[PDB]
Amino acid sequence: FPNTISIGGLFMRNTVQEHSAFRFAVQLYNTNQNTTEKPFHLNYHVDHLDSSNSFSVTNAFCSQFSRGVYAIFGFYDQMSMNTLTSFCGALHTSFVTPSFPTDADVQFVIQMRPALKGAILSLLSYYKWEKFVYLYDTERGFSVLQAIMEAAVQNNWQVTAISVGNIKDVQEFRRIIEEMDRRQEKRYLIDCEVERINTILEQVVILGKHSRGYHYMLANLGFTDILLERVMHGGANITGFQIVNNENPMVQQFIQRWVRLDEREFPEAKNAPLKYTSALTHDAILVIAEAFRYLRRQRVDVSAGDCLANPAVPWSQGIDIERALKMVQVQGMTGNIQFDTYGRRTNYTIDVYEMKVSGSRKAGYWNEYERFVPIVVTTILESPYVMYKKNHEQLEGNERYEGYCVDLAYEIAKHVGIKYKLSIVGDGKYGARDPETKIWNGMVGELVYGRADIAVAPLTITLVREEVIDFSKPFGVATPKGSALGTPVNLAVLKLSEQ
Amino acid sequence: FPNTISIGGLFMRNTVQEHSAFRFAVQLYNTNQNTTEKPFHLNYHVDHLDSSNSFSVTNAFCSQFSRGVYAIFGFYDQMSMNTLTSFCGALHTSFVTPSFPTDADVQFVIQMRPALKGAILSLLSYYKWEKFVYLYDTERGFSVLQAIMEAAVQNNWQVTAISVGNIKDVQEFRRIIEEMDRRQEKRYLIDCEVERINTILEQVVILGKHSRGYHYMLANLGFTDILLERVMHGGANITGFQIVNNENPMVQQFIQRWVRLDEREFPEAKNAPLKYTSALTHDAILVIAEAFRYLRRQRVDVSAGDCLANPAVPWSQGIDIERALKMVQVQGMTGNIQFDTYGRRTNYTIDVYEMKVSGSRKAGYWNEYERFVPF
């Protein structure tokens, strides 16, 4: 058994802190005094990628492989995911990565980041969400998207998915929020990188739509690194996830010894919050060190060329190494550590945080077995149907309207048992179709496109409209297609007529 | 100047007609009699690859480079364009391909597929489209998606973009069509591969949404391969684009000699319609041959190392090779062939077809300077 173990390192851009944790964690292992806990020295070879062109990524990997390493620890993103994953599998070299888990199962890579699809789905059922907006990108895989859309069919939800992956101008973000606001959408499910989430919820506050009613779910680990001071002032609910618990004694010891380090040797150490990826980076050394300690106990023999060789014959000890790495069980900084056959984390735990005006609070945990143990009415102005009261300037609310229709709306609401907020269509027309643009206008246009629920007004009944919206019997009021207020209002007017 | 010129091939799966067309075009050039038009012999080292991996793709490319080639002609999909494009640009080896044009500006890549951004935008403004449903997938870059979104903000459109690139169960397609119809959406703009377009148009006819009133604009240069006979009879409106014109004397001559070929040595000949990608493959051999003849006439020095080397030393003469290939002006099947500084074609002649009950009808043509001119 070699007296020293060499492992590779591949760090992409904007990962300076993770580099410090990688260096710090290795130092802690080396400085240990007990012979049993430190049976061999540990070395490492760092390298920086570009993640833009596969020539740089391929060259960097071959430099590491040719030099001679046992395992490789590094990050990858969408562009360079395929190059590193494919090379590692063919050459029989493990790859301990804290990056997002791969969508398709693959061998010889162990991804130590818990998935969220299970946690998200349970919370959606817990809050009983039926319709909402879903903003997403493709910087972390399609796994979450393919589960939300698949679950919508089985539960008959009304998800409205939007892809904001390629948006580069804040105008698109503003229009998306405004357009979905017109449809009375109060629930959003933001699943994007940290930078995008900051931009998205910076637009909501400028638009001033962080009031009491709206609820936001931030499906992204790293709930600490999201600016939330401004949004929470309005009172809008917010929900996030975390895996690093500050009350665990292990994190407290690491954090206590992590802030006293010299700045020059370990940049961005003391005056910066600790990203969860730093916690995963520290854990990786525990997993790799533990795996090699086991390999030493069993007296398993272990001991390079160039990547592109025909035929590509891999060194036979690779299978043993990954088996050891996929069997360890260590109580790490992020909780229990256990890997299944394909290398994904299992028996993990996510802590959900429901943060309020006073501050963040822990609202429960999501174990893998115990899952999450804790009307606007449109109308047009036409006397005597709807008219302004004697003094509409002083009055506020729907108390400034007086006429025939407002009386009818009150009677219908009382029968059904709802609350109505009278609104005036700004177009000023009953409704018609433009022959060239095929765009409805007026009351029917608003009613069809989901901007209203019922429409009490002198809306003449005709064949053209009846094909688009469901009227009631003549008195007729209108409702969207498939709305649940169709039958109750139809009977309400019929019984009113009989009296 | 060498007595013979050797190039390479890189064909992925679902590519048989193009492979036979690539062989036929080379044979056509080699068998010519006029010594002025056939100064040098041409050869190829065709090789197949699997894009699903990135270890076999680079392994196949490095074998081509080590063998020694002057230019490489091959295809690439979304998940393997980075490896091919990046290696070529770093080792100074041109790459003539008929596949989809790249989103970014990259050198040492010559693309023979005309873009569709201009044609779609002009048609949308000509038909007064201000409320449509944009179904799309990302198998051919995001170039079209950005153009539509940027145009919508400027022109104040209302686009409901839905990504259908990751749908395997047809029930999802049914829900999308049913819901969008509930909002009174009559105009669609389907931008997907040929296989997916067939699936979508299959669900439309089953649902009975193919009657008069609905307008479908198939944004793909494959109008001669979409199975839409059923929708034709329904009465809906269909619009499509094409680049290959059957009245061109060159097209007619090639097809006359195309169907007479052997059915075993040249598979997919005399059996299936000539996919437009086969036309681009024939034009690629026109461009490669013409560019190298020009170099021989001008008395330029052209005349292999390891695939990967820490000192990246490119060819000294590879700038000349890819400079000549971008000056060509050779009339071919797809109209005028002429490249700009980035390897993207210029002076297109995109052709618009509108289909009626009688049959497909020439509705007009779109040009970069004259935009859309109907007749």
From Swiss-Prot, chain A:
Disulfide bonds: 62-307
Homology family: Belongs to the glutamate-gated ion channel (TC 1.A.10.1) family. GRIA3 subfamily.
Glycosylation site list: 34, 237, 347
Membrane topology: Multi-pass membrane protein
Superkingdom of origin organism: Eukaryota
Binding-site positions, L-glutamate: 458, 460, 465
UniProt keywords, alphabetically: Cell membrane, Disulfide bond, Glycoprotein, Ion channel, Ion transport, Ligand-gated ion channel, Lipoprotein, Membrane, Palmitate, Phosphoprotein, Postsynaptic cell membrane, Receptor, Signal, Synapse, Transmembrane, Transmembrane helix, Transport
Record InterPro entries: ANF_lig-bd_rcpt, Glu/Gly-bd, Iono_Glu_rcpt_met, Ionotropic_Glu_rcpt, Iontro_rcpt_C, Peripla_BP_I
Function text: Ionotropic glutamate receptor that functions as a ligand-gated cation channel, gated by L-glutamate and glutamatergic agonists such as alpha-amino-3-hydroxy-5-methyl-4-isoxazolepropionic acid (AMPA), quisqualic acid, and kainic acid. L-glutamate acts as an excitatory neurotransmitter at many synapses in the central nervous system and plays an important role in fast excitatory synaptic transmission by inducing long-term potentiation.
GO cellular component: AMPA glutamate receptor complex; asymmetric synapse; dendrite; dendritic shaft; dendritic spine; glutamatergic synapse; ionotropic glutamate receptor complex; membrane
GO molecular function: AMPA glutamate receptor activity; amyloid-beta binding; glutamate-gated calcium ion channel activity; glutamate-gated receptor activity; ligand-gated monoatomic ion channel activity involved in regulation of presynaptic membrane potential; transmitter-gated monoatomic ion channel activity involved in regulation of postsynaptic membrane potential
Note: The postsynaptic actions of Glu are mediated by a variety of receptors that are named according to their selective agonists. This receptor binds AMPA (quisqualate) > glutamate > kainate.
Name of the gene encoding the protein in the UniProt record: Gria3
Location(s), subcellular: Cell membrane; Postsynaptic cell membrane; Postsynaptic density membrane
Pfam families associated with the record: ANF_receptor, Lig_chan, Lig_chan-Glu_bd
Protein name: Glutamate receptor 3
Assembly, per entry: Homotetramer or heterotetramer of pore-forming glutamate receptor subunits. Tetramers may be formed by the dimerization of dimers. Interacts with PICK1, GRIP1 and GRIP2. Found in a complex with GRIA1, GRIA2, GRIA4, CNIH2, CNIH3, CACNG2, CACNG3, CACNG4, CACNG5, CACNG7 and CACNG8. Interacts with CACNG5. Found in a complex with GRIA1, GRIA2, GRIA4, DLG4, CACNG8 and CNIH2.
Residues exposed to the Extracellular side: 1-475
Catalytic activity: Ca(2+)(in) = Ca(2+)(out)
From Swiss-Prot, chain B:
Extracellular membrane side: 1-375
Disulfide bond positions: 62-307
Subcellular location: Cell membrane; Postsynaptic cell membrane; Postsynaptic density membrane
Residues with attached carbohydrate: 34, 237, 347
Description of how the protein assembles with itself and partners: Homotetramer or heterotetramer of pore-forming glutamate receptor subunits. Tetramers may be formed by the dimerization of dimers. Interacts with PICK1, GRIP1 and GRIP2. Found in a complex with GRIA1, GRIA2, GRIA4, CNIH2, CNIH3, CACNG2, CACNG3, CACNG4, CACNG5, CACNG7 and CACNG8. Interacts with CACNG5. Found in a complex with GRIA1, GRIA2, GRIA4, DLG4, CACNG8 and CNIH2.
Other comment: The postsynaptic actions of Glu are mediated by a variety of receptors that are named according to their selective agonists. This receptor binds AMPA (quisqualate) > glutamate > kainate.
Family label: Belongs to the glutamate-gated ion channel (TC 1.A.10.1) family. GRIA3 subfamily.
Task of the protein: Ionotropic glutamate receptor that functions as a ligand-gated cation channel, gated by L-glutamate and glutamatergic agonists such as alpha-amino-3-hydroxy-5-methyl-4-isoxazolepropionic acid (AMPA), quisqualic acid, and kainic acid. L-glutamate acts as an excitatory neurotransmitter at many synapses in the central nervous system and plays an important role in fast excitatory synaptic transmission by inducing long-term potentiation.
This protein's name: Glutamate receptor 3
Organism: Rattus norvegicus (Rat)
